Amino acid sequence: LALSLTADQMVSALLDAEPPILYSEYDPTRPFSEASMMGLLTNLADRELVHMINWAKRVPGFVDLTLHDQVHLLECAWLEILMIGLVWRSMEHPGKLLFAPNLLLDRNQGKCVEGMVEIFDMLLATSSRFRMMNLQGEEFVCLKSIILLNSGVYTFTLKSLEEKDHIHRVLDKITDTLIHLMAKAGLTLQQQHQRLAQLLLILSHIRHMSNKGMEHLYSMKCKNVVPLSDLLLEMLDAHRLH
């Protein structure tokens, strides 16, 4: 079980569950349109989702849950999860968003997507933050696993409170793991809980980038700017949006 996993076993699994970086259908023979670019992001996301699902299954504790619950967590966190990955791989790329190794854009390029720039600025901002704190991989996968368990737990009869409690126990281990990491990194006790605070506070901005991300997507949807996969349609649905 996930609760008898130790810190270092917790980290090994997560790094081992990490998805691949996927390439965009990037066609450099034409200039971007609004429709084209959005196509590229929605194509990329669509393919990341399939891998994401398989990543979740290797997130300790997560397979202990009923399908309906796994469905719900994922429906809640999917865009946060995509955005925190994007930010992470954008880390060493100042001023740019690395959606894929062949799709490295700057705020000037998302220009032609109506309403995208605001969200672009936010994501580059988060990336500069991770860069400035010097976010580590071992810490990144921890954050990412936190996001997946957390975001939809509040929105969970008797098997309900055991499932909730289960997720809380697991989130506690990952907290124990984050600390382990910082201690090992040679941080003082004070610096540990300061750091732990700074990263968890970053999740708030990621939830926030997600919500704005979702609403923008709904408007590309409602404008017939881009066709969305039956999966995308469904995940945007979950956010019962408007």
């Binding site: 299954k57 399908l67 469905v71 429906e75 999966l231 469904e234």
Partner: peptide, 10 residues
């Protein structure tokens, strides 16, 4: 029969 649900069994 949601898509995600089936994808979560494969």
């Amino acid at each position: 029969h949601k898509i995600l649900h089936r994808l979560l069994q494969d």
